[PDB]
């Protein structure tokens, strides 16, 4: 219903975000690795960090899907919808952050083979957003299941 | 792609540019001009072409070095200065903008020229939106940094030279002639790329776009050759703007520029380019011009595009160089040396 | 001047040559390559009869 | 219905993803081909990666077809529509990523064909975005018919 | 009745895809031919690749036209409409990819004449994108005519 | 009512098409005639190729005119609408291809007059697009038409 | 009603196109004439061409004016409507193609007087669009009130 | 009703048209005049072509006032409306045409005073349009008021 | 109701017009004073010209307001609206014309002080619209006053 | 009611109007002040010129506040709504104009100390719209005030 578009939102927006993420870092990555091949290992960590946001999205979706009843009310629909939304767009925006930092961090990697850990830290501040949505989304899901109540 | 847009302004600007191309020197004419040794004969032959009118206007019993510049400088006034009066819109600002990129290098040379105490009438032909009868003189005589900024503001649209003159104050382009020119060359290319960004969504660029890449690598390679067997500074920008960092790298440009005769990086890079590691400076020069010459010619028959006009503006710079270079050799009763190759390219 | 020169070219030009008299009104001047030349220096077309024009 | 527009949405969005991937990857491919003529084999495989997204997109669409209602509801329609979106824009996003990384990767191949294999592994990380949506969509279709026309 | 618009949508958007394909490809061919004119034979094989999408689009239209009748049920209309969208717009997207690569490979051809055939191979991958989409519309259509029920 | 919109669509979109086609190709011609003053006959053929789309148009537009009812039925009406669409936007797509190609081909001609047959050949590929729209329309229209008073 | 707006359409759109054509050719003619006083007579001919578009547009308008009323059938209204658009939007596009090629034809005069006729030739083909709308629009006028409106 | 909007419409378009004209031509005139101070009379002849459009509009507009009462038929309304359009579109179109030609025609004056008359010929071709609006509007107006019939 | 919007059109539109005129004019004058510092007094006379249209706009509005009822009549209403439009938009358009010409004319004044008044004559020509608006606006108003009675 | 939407228009648009004026003039005065420090006193007068309008607008808002009561009817509502409109949009436009002349005028100031007053004369011209507006608004406000039908 309004649950199904929640589920869609969750897996879709978190995916758009991660794609961008990967894309940007990827250009930077591909360049630096074929000039120095010991920096292959450093590269790997920005790209996959943006990958895990999507997997929390997938979980939330399964809940809403299963929680859909038989001709649920408009009021019920919105509570389900709202959970789905929270994980998707928080995902999109974490995805944006991780890739923009990631790309400049690939330049950091090349010049500083020792400050590998510092670059990682910048990325990690964008992952709190994903957490912020996921939590709230769960509390909303459990309640969201009412199954007709105007 | 292009031509999806309806523009009154572009109509005139394209036709006028095309009008010049048509009177331009052919292959047959170049062959005819090389042959010459009589001063009077050169005059007669040249007259048919678009440049030929200027020769006819005032004639003399002897051709001088002075006369040849004056004809070419006069032709730029017609091709470039005049067209802006009869134009408006986004089409005019593009004519202004590419000229301002030429202006950046040219004025900086004028400013330096004042310090050596060269004259304003001793400045030789180069494309501008106002010739030497207005803006170029006011800039030339002033040696103070402040007064240069004020002169750029009168012009519409504002020229990049405001940013460039601020830089060289703070000594971010250094003292020496070399260093400033190299960094300013990167500035030239930096502004060229930005002008491409604004203009592209309505008329699509194809031949221009490939040409803008080819010019980027090409320029970094021309500075690298120039400062070879001299000195190059590694933290300073003298590696120029490149399209991609996986196409050629800053590092390879800088090694090549340093004095060790380490041509081999150019050769490895070049797999379908006409420049390749060579220790012959002259052979390279022939090859950079032919290469630069191509993708201009495909544009000239491509039409109702902003792309077309860009390629022509840089093509007119190459045509002026070539015409003056052939003309000069015959004046002083010499036969074309490296010049012979670049006539037909 | 023009109409005068034309009435002379047509009247007297025949003496110079049958093909060498063309109709011209106003001074024709050519200077393009060695295929078109007009001057007393070099020429490949001129007045068929002897004529100089003097203007102040 | 709106169930029919579900099929529509799947096949269109995922075609755009795949198209972008193939387009971009292609430019890179074409370029690289003048700089070295022995890398053709390596160069072509990035393209076929974005080629598997489309196939996933078909199983959903067929699924939806079979599951169509008798005249449907406003709610039935929505469960099916929502599924089309999930597979379709997860595809658009997986397909976009494959093409940027792809493109930069062929400059990678040009300089060093040995760490080409390294770039493939980056490419595979974009495909999971498509998968998570493909999975979610399945579940939705299965729900739509259950409850004897929702 | 919305099925009529189905017929219309398939054959318009798909044609526009081929239009795009040819427009872009053309500019690349016309340029290649003046530089090196012996590559004609190669140059022509790519352009006609975009012409084949449209051809599947007509078949769908004709079949549907006879089954439309003068009047039909509402439910039937809406499935015929959605079916029409699937091929139309996938057609559109397949044409864009084919027109960018098409362009890029002719530029490849001029400079070095060796991996010309690889350029061609990329175009053929976008033809899948039209096929899959086309399959699913056809199935919707045949089943949809029953005067309510698919 | 909806039959009027069929009439217009037909006669408008097909004109526009032709305009684009003719305009662009025209520019290309003018330029070559003063760079080369002998290629006159070759150049002229591309431009005039468009506008023939218009004649197929006139037939379908003229049919819908007569049948433009006082009061129209919904079921009948939409088939009459769709019918116009099909010739029109197909004419547009054909035109758009032909004008791009048209302008570009006169460059082929200018630099070498040997591949003249090959420039034309790019155009012809796009003209089949105008045909397919008409065919489809022909079929919708036949049924849709029931003279005055639908 | 629909008659009133029928009137309006033919006279607006065909006028715009003409305004454009005349204007744009105009810029070009002024430039050419100072550089060439001799070919003045030729230069002038392109601008005059776009004025005649407006005249066919106008003929239709006057006709619709006479049939106008809200005291007559829906059928009179709708027929006025379709007549308006038919000549209206084709005039508009005719205006564009005449004005684009027109501007370019001034250069064609200046460098070769002789192949000025090639310029004209291209224009004469763009004029078919005025004709195509006008034919159809005339007949709609005759339909609305009989024997070309009495 | 709509008849007031007819009046209103006329003053907006015809004002805007004339504005655009006098502006365009003006910039060219003011700029050009520094070179030659004896081009006054010439300069003006562009500018007054457009000054008469607005005043023709004024005759039509005023007529419509007097005829606009406390309440009147729908019939009178739609026909007034249409009288208003007519002047509206001519004012719009003629103004835009004139200002382009004039701007460019000052470059014509400066270099050559002898071919001023050719510049005039251009300017007189744009005045047609003004007339075609004014004529039509008056005719509509006279007819309009006759009252009765929904 | 309609009266308040009557107020809006006149007082917004002429104020923006006038504002633009002043603004542009200003720039030109402020620039010029450094080269020539005694021609100020003559420049200013065009500038103040567009502000008196606005004082008229505001008079038109205040009438309509008091003259509005709560009874409502559409016909009476549209006349109140239709009157404001006329001075609002005529005003906007004068304001654009005088600032454009005005700005270009300060370069004219700069070189050729003596013949400044020729620039004024061209500039003043767009004042007519303001007048045109006033006249028409006044008459409509006078009817419109009735208290929106049917 | 509708009056509260009126009150907003007055306080919002006039504030935006002045804000721009402060902004535009300010950036210019900040540059001027490091090369000429004695002209401070003078520069301060163009920026503060925009300031005087803003105080007009505020006076009105405070008025409107007192004038609402706590309930209003539709007739009363609209007169305050339209009343508010006047100082906000005229003010908005006047504030915009003064910011442009003001800025460009500081560069005039810079080069000629003396003619600071000449720039001031240009600024005051734009103020007439703001004053006039204010007056008109005030009169309407005062009659309006009574509430639940005026």
Swiss-Prot record, chains A, D, E, F, G, H, I, J:
Subunit structure, interactors included: V-ATPase is a heteromultimeric enzyme composed of a peripheral catalytic V1 complex (components A to H) attached to an integral membrane V0 proton pore complex (components: a, c, c', c'', d, e, f and VOA1). The decameric c-ring forms the proton-conducting pore, and is composed of eight proteolipid subunits c, one subunit c' and one subunit c''.
UniProt-listed CDD domains: ATP-synt_Vo_c_ATP6C_rpt1, ATP-synt_Vo_c_ATP6C_rpt2
Vacuolar side: 65-80, 141-150
Family that this chain belongs to: Belongs to the V-ATPase proteolipid subunit family.
Gene from which the chain derives: VMA3
Site (Essential for proton translocation): 127
Function: Proton-conducting pore forming subunit of the V0 complex of vacuolar(H+)-ATPase (V-ATPase), a multisubunit enzyme composed of a peripheral complex (V1) that hydrolyzes ATP and a membrane integral complex (V0) that translocates protons. V-ATPase is responsible for acidifying and maintaining the pH of intracellular compartments.
Other comment: Present with 8450 molecules/cell in log phase SD medium.
Protein name as catalogued: V-type proton ATPase subunit c
Species in which this protein is naturally found: Saccharomyces cerevisiae (strain ATCC 204508 / S288c) (Baker's yeast)
Compartments where located: Vacuole membrane
Swiss-Prot record, chain B:
Annotated InterPro entries: ATPase_csu/dsu_sf (IPR036079), ATPase_V0-cplx_csu/dsu (IPR002843), ATPase_V0-cplx_dsu (IPR016727), V-type_ATPase_csu/dsu (IPR035067), V-type_ATPase_csu/dsu_dom_3 (IPR044911)
Main location: membrane
Functional summary from the UniProt entry: Subunit of the V0 complex of vacuolar(H+)-ATPase (V-ATPase), a multisubunit enzyme composed of a peripheral complex (V1) that hydrolyzes ATP and a membrane integral complex (V0) that translocates protons. V-ATPase is responsible for acidifying and maintaining the pH of intracellular compartments. This subunit is a non-integral membrane component of the membrane pore domain and is required for proper assembly of the V0 sector. Might be involved in the regulated assembly of V1 subunits onto the membrane sector or alternatively may prevent the passage of protons through V0 pores.
Subcellular location as annotated: Vacuole membrane
Gene Ontology BP terms: endosomal lumen acidification; Golgi lumen acidification; proton transmembrane transport; vacuolar acidification; vacuolar transport
PANTHER family named among the record's database cross-references: VACUOLAR ATP SYNTHASE SUBUNIT AC39
Membrane topology: Peripheral membrane protein
Family: Belongs to the V-ATPase V0D/AC39 subunit family.
The encoding gene: VMA6
Stated name of the protein: V-type proton ATPase subunit d
Quaternary structure and partners: V-ATPase is a heteromultimeric enzyme composed of a peripheral catalytic V1 complex (components A to H) attached to an integral membrane V0 proton pore complex (components: a, c, c', c'', d, e, f and VOA1).
Modified residues (N-acetylmethionine): 1
Curated annotation (Swiss-Prot), chain C:
Transmembrane segments: none
Subcellular localization, as worded in the UniProt entry: Vacuole membrane
Source species, domain of life: Eukaryota
Subunit structure: V-ATPase is a heteromultimeric enzyme composed of a peripheral catalytic V1 complex (components A to H) attached to an integral membrane V0 proton pore complex (components: a, c, c', c'', d, e, f and VOA1). Interacts directly with VMA4.
Membership in a protein family: Belongs to the V-ATPase C subunit family.
Described purpose of this protein according to its UniProt entry: Subunit of the V1 complex of vacuolar(H+)-ATPase (V-ATPase), a multisubunit enzyme composed of a peripheral complex (V1) that hydrolyzes ATP and a membrane integral complex (V0) that translocates protons. V-ATPase is responsible for acidifying and maintaining the pH of intracellular compartments. Subunit C is necessary for the assembly of the catalytic sector of the enzyme and is likely to have a specific function in its catalytic activity. Reversibly leaves the enzyme after glucose depletion, causing the catalytic subcomplex V1 to detach from the V0 section.
Miscellaneous comment in the UniProt entry for this protein: Present with 21114 molecules/cell in log phase SD medium.
Name of the protein described by the UniProt record: V-type proton ATPase subunit C
Biological source species: Saccharomyces cerevisiae (strain ATCC 204508 / S288c) (Baker's yeast)
Protein's gene: VMA5
